[PDB]
């Protein structure tokens, strides 16, 4: 996250860190029940050096605050049993960029490990609304990742505006969230993590999943996120959640 700040410990207890074997933190995810995480499909596609689609290649860390302290009290390490990537996911456009990760053994809920609520299909996150991205991704464009989880406040952008800021790249499954002025954005290593939204009454819903962007924090180039409300039934169908 560029232009953010350190999270308070336990502030985002649904944020998960996904490490690939021999590589450390690669992607974020979010805890939606004791057994299931939500992440981005593009994180789990093989490349020439490594089978990212193979659930055996991954370790999830729940309750993690600091990447240098993976054995801190409250950190929970879990293997993955299964990766369900959305069947319509397109590798080129990142349309339908969502995946569900099944833990081999369940999360134990605590001060540091708690699920985030899923929005119904009808749930509106209006243009202009301040919401949050979190992650251990790069903190400056051209820079490096964070040891301490970062949070950034960004605003939902109108879909027509989003479509024309990134011409011929935006589908109805996507949302732009950020600023026309740049400054605050997700960045490399934030992929798969949650967009968290606080409602007027204080309830927190997951609005989206960090998907892609043209650079980070640049003018007229807000980060792109998978809209979660559209996937409510699909999540229920595949997980029971």
């Amino acid at each position: 996250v560029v232009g953010g700040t350190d999270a308070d410990e336990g502030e985002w207890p649904w944020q998960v860190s996904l490490h690939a074997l021999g590589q450390g933190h690669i992607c974020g995810a979010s805890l939606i029940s004791p057994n299931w995480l939500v992440s981005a499909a593009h994180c789990y596609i093989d490349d020439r050096g490594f089978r990212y689609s193979d659930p055996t290649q991954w370790t999830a860390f729940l309750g993690l605050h600091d990447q240098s302290q993976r054995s801190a009290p409250g950190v929970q390490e879990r293997r993955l049993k299964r990766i369900i990537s959305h069947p319509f996911f397109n590798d080129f456009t990142f349309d339908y960029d969502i995946a569900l990760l099944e833990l081999e053994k369940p999360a134990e809920y605590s001060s540091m490990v708690r699920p985030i609520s899923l929005p119904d299909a009808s749930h509106v996150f209006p243009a202009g609304k301040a919401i949050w991205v979190t992650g251990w991704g790069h903190t400056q464009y051209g820079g490096t990742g964070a040891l301490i989880l970062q949070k950034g406040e960004i605003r939902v952008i109108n879909q027509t505006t989003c479509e024309n800021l990134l011409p011929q790249q935006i589908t109805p499954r996507m949302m732009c969230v950020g600023f026309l002025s740049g400054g605050v954005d997700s960045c490399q290593g934030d992929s798969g993590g949650p967009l968290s939204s606080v409602e007027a009454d204080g309830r927190i819903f997951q609005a989206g999943v960090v998907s892609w962007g043209d650079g980070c924090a640049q003018r007229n180039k807000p980060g792109v996120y998978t809209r979660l409300p559209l996937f409510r039934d699909w999540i229920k169908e595949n997980t029971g959640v």
Partner: antibody, heavy 125, light 107 residues
Framework: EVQLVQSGAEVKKPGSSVKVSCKASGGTFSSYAISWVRQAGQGLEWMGGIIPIFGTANYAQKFQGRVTITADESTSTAYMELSSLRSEDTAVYYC???????????????????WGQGTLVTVSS | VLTQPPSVSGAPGQRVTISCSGSSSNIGSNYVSWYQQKPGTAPKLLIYDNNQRPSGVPDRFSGSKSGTSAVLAITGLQSEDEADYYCQSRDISQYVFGGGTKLTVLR
């Protein structure tokens, strides 16, 4: 496994044009870009590139004007045409396939991982 | 305009570093990659995004960046590392290479 195979060496009279091709052996460019780089003996020089499936060419300033870069996903072949050839254009021209065009927030032209074998263009009469 | 020393030397086993000096519009604002070119061979990507090593690149290669400079370190160099090494960065809307550094192995 990906392999890019380039067209044969050419000899071109100064002032002529050359069009070098670069075929992706697997029949598809998939979600990757093609970048063109030459080695004229002084060091590597970026010429430009294009995403073949989503094609609008990007060019290096030095070669703006004289270079045209195209690509056809159906024949999985990319092309670089260099016109008004100079003696100093005597070089080995490489095409290279980049990383995935959307996986890295930093982009792709700086991530050239699969290289063609090079095409020698000798500019001489 | 990325500047590299034209020549660096080290003996087998030695650690050597190869510097790439740029400006705000390139290295200062962007990630740096590094490439090796062995004689008579197409270039090979060693490092991207400042310090990331693709699979099939020897562990002895590493990268760093600070401000408007970047460095490739070859730790434990061997006789077969005799080659030219190039840094690469975006510069505004184009990509640029450093002038290249030839590694001489000391004997």
């Amino acid at each position: 496994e990906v392999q890019l195979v380039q067209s044969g060496a050419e000899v071109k009279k100064p002032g002529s044009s050359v069009k070098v091709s670069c075929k992706a052996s697997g029949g598809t460019f998939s979600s990757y870009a093609i970048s063109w780089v030459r080695q004229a003996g002084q060091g590597l020089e970026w010429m430009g590139g294009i995403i073949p499936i989503f094609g609008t060419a990007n060019y290096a300033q030095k070669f703006q004007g004289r270079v045209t870069i195209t690509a056809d996903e159906s024949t999985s072949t990319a092309y670089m045409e260099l016109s008004s050839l100079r003696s100093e254009d005597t070089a080995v021209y490489y095409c290279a396939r980049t990383f995935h065009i959307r996986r890295y927030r930093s982009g792709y032209y700086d991530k050239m991982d699969h290289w063609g074998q090079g095409t020698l263009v000798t500019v001489s009469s | 305009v990325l500047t590299q020393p034209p020549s660096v030397s080290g003996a087998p086993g030695q650690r050597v570093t190869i510097s790439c000096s740029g400006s705000s519009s390139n290295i200062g604002s962007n990630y740096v990659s590094w490439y090796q070119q062995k004689p008579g061979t197409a270039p090979k990507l060693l490092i991207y995004d400042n310090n990331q090593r693709p699979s099939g690149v020897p562990d002895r290669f590493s990268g760093s960046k600070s401000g408007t400079s970047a460095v490739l370190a070859i730790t434990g160099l061997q006789s077969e590392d005799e080659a030219d090494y190039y840094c690469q960065s975006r510069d505004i809307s184009q990509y640029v290479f450093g002038g290249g550094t030839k590694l001489t192995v000391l004997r």
